[PDB]
Amino acid sequence: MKQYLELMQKVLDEGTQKNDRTGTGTLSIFGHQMRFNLQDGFPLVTTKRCHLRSIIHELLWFLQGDTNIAYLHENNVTIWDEWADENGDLGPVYGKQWRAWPTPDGRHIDQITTVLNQLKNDPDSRRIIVSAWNVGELDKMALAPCHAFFQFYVADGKLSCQLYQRSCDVFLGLPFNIASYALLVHMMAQQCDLEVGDFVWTGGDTHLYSNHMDQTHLQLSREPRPLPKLIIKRKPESIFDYRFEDFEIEGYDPHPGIKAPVAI
Amino acid sequence: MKQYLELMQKVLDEGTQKNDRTGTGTLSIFGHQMRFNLQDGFPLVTTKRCHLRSIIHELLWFLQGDTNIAYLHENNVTIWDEWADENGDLGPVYGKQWRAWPTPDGRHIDQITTVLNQLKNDPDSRRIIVSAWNVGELDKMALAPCHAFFQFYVADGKLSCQLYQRSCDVFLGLPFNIASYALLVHMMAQQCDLEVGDFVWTGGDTHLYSNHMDQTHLQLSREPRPLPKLIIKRKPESIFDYRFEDFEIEGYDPHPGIKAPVAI
Ligand SMILES: C#CCN(Cc1ccc2[nH]c(N)nc(=O)c2c1)c1ccc(C(=O)N[C@@H](CCC(=O)O)C(=O)O)cc1
Ligand SMILES: C#CCN(Cc1ccc2[nH]c(N)nc(=O)c2c1)c1ccc(C(=O)N[C@@H](CCC(=O)O)C(=O)O)cc1
Ligand SMILES: C[C@H]1O[C@@H](n2ccc(=O)[nH]c2=O)C[C@@H]1O
Numbered sequence: 001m002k003q004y005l006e007l008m009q010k011v012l013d014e015g016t017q018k019n020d021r022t023g024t025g026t027l028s029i030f031g032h033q034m035r036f037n038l039q040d041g042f043p044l045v046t047t048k049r050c051h052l053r054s055i056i057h058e059l060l061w062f063l064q065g066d067t068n069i070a071y072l073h074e075n076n077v078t079i080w081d082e083w084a085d086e087n088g089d090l091g092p093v094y095g096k097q098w099r100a101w102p103t104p105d106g107r108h109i110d111q112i113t114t115v116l117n118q119l120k121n122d123p124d125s126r127r128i129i130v131s132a133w134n135v136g137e138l139d140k141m142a143l144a145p146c147h148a149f150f151q152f153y154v155a156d157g158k159l160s161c162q163l164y165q166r167s168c169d170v171f172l173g174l175p176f177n178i179a180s181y182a183l184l185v186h187m188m189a190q191q192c193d194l195e196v197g198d199f200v201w202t203g204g205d206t207h208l209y210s211n212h213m214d215q216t217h218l219q220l221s222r223e224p225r226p227l228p229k230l231i232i233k234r235k236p237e238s239i240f241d242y243r244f245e246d247f248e249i250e251g252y253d254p255h256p257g258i259k260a261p262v263a264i
Numbered sequence: 265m266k267q268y269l270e271l272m273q274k275v276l277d278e279g280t281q282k283n284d285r286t287g288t289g290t291l292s293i294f295g296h297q298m299r300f301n302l303q304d305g306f307p308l309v310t311t312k313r314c315h316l317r318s319i320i321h322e323l324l325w326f327l328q329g330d331t332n333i334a335y336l337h338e339n340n341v342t343i344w345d346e347w348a349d350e351n352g353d354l355g356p357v358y359g360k361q362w363r364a365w366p367t368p369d370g371r372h373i374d375q376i377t378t379v380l381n382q383l384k385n386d387p388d389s390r391r392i393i394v395s396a397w398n399v400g401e402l403d404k405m406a407l408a409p410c411h412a413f414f415q416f417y418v419a420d421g422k423l424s425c426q427l428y429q430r431s432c433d434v435f436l437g438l439p440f441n442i443a444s445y446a447l448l449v450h451m452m453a454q455q456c457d458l459e460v461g462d463f464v465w466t467g468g469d470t471h472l473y474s475n476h477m478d479q480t481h482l483q484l485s486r487e488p489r490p491l492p493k494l495i496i497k498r499k500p501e502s503i504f505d506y507r508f509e510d511f512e513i514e515g516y517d518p519h520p521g522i523k524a525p526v527a528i
């Protein structure tokens with residue numbers, strides 16, 4: 001996509017070499033922002049082939065509150081296996097913080113049905129936030145939340161969302177995280193009878209690992225293709241009632257897949 | 265400053281008209297980021313006289329983990345009055361979250377000591393974050409945090425910071441928060457023997473109240489002058505024992521103050 005390829009060229013032209021926990025080495029810039037107007041097409045990268053099947057099942061899993069990879073295995077998704085313990089558990093990550101964030105006095109807040117009552121009854125609220133970054137449970141988590149915090153906004157009968165991603169692997173993770181959120185925004189907009197506004201992405205430490213460099217320049221040599229289209233064949237009673245089958249992507253013509261190692 | 269004046273102009277040009285919770289009405293955009301290189305000078309506005317005495321007692325009040333306006337009345341700063349109760353408490357806002365975030369199991373987390381040790385023992389960390397958006401305790405706060413989340417970063421011996429502001433009064437609140445956070449990056453860099461880097465400001469619902477149009481046009485017609493320079497006169501034993509005496513600004517020659525009505 002024009003925004004994505006421009007970002008990669010920006011950490012390659014402006015990035016500094018860092019070191020990290022996986023010990024792999026990275027080129028890194030700090031602070032970046034881009035916008036996808038969702039009326040223009042579903043933001044799924046066309047200059048390498050992406051696997052939607054993993055993106056829809058991961059999102060459906062987050063919305064059910066589940067944090068054990070059993071659901072994901074049932075559906076042939078293996079994206080979280082490396083971080084999951086003996087029993088499939090990932091600890092209190094995204095799904096749990098979203099559906100049941102624990103309070104000091106034993107309550108639990110459901111941040112997804114809350115954001116939906118705000119979109120319905122007070123869409124002009126400046127408080128329409130969901131946060132996965134609970135400081136109090138980070139130590140019990142498999143990996144610390146990358147897509148940490150996000151906020152919805154309504155303007156001319158259209159729903160917009162801004163994510164703050166504190167750490168971004170531009171080659172491997174970012175294709176995934178922007179199609180995940182663009183898909184959450186069509187689901188909230190279908191439920192609130194609103195149109196789709198924009199997906200604003202904001203990055204903290206936005207980087208490219210050293211062992212993703214030739215791949216990065218291979219992708220960068222491709223001309224982006226026309227952006228796909230999301231067709232939803234049903235309007236479930238709730239945001240928690242979607243199924244994989246209700247989602248169709250039309251017009252998707254990517255350049256060939258590019259393979260690359262995942263850091264530990 | 266040029267970055268700040270441009271956002272004022274982006275909200276008047278592009279802003280949508282919204283009805284906010286005070287009934288006053290706002291010119292509003294969603295999603296904006298501004299980068300400040302703190303080597304080029306202290307980012308205090310010069311097209312209107314900003315008052316650093318309130319900016320600095322509030323930040324030392326925050327680092328103390330105090331949520332009561334008592335200390336703030338002793339130093340003649342009146343910014344928190346109409347939101348405190350009849351005993352002076354604001355409930356667990358910023359300072360309580362920064363110094364003592366409560367787990368569901370009794371314990372507390374000191375996010376500034378956590379960040380101090382990360383900049384001194386793991387400076388390449390992509391988790392150098394402090395958050396004040398505690399979803400369990402939002403009910404308990406006199407006002408939900410506007411400056412909700414921030415992340416530090418170190419690259420070639422420089423300390424950077426990025427703040428996410430979910431709500432921003434451009435004419436009134438924004439000069440205050442830019443000076444406040446840029447001030448903390450100097451404190452942190454001084455304790456951690458680092459040089460100062462960029463101050464990335466990202467905003468969600470960025471807005472200008474309708475009753476602030478006159479003052480905006482007045483300020484938008486004034487030319488930005490040289491940024492001040494900040495001096496920290498002595499080096500304290502920790503970040504917790506600084507005082508108002510320790511801070512100074514040479515070369516700050518601003519335009520007159522500009523008086524504006526506050527909305528509640
Ligand atoms: C983001 C996210 C969720 N996640 C979780 C997640 C966890 C740790 C991480 N660690 C690193 N180094 N990079 C990541 O982006 C990352 C992502 C993902 C997990 C696997 C793949 C992956 O291996 N990629 C594809 C290859 C093609 C593609 O990029 O889609 C694959 O399925 O093999 C992607 C995302
Ligand atoms: C941001 C923040 C913290 N805060 C808290 C805070 C809380 C609620 C708010 N509500 C509204 N409507 N706008 C705000 O900017 C705002 C700010 C502030 C409090 C007061 C001033 C203010 O009125 N500044 C005046 C007078 C202060 C002075 O004399 O120094 C000025 O003209 O500078 C700014 C920020
Ligand atoms: C933890 C490492 O994987 C990256 N990562 C992880 C999860 C995710 O949603 N997106 C992403 O890019 C961040 C960092 O490079």
Ligand SMILES: C[C@H]1O[C@@H](n2ccc(=O)[nH]c2=O)C[C@@H]1O
Pocket residue numbers: 410411431432433434436437438441
């Ligand atoms: C809640 C109202 O006050 C504003 N507000 C509050 C605190 C702060 O630091 N900055 C700011 O702009 C946001 C909105 O106009």
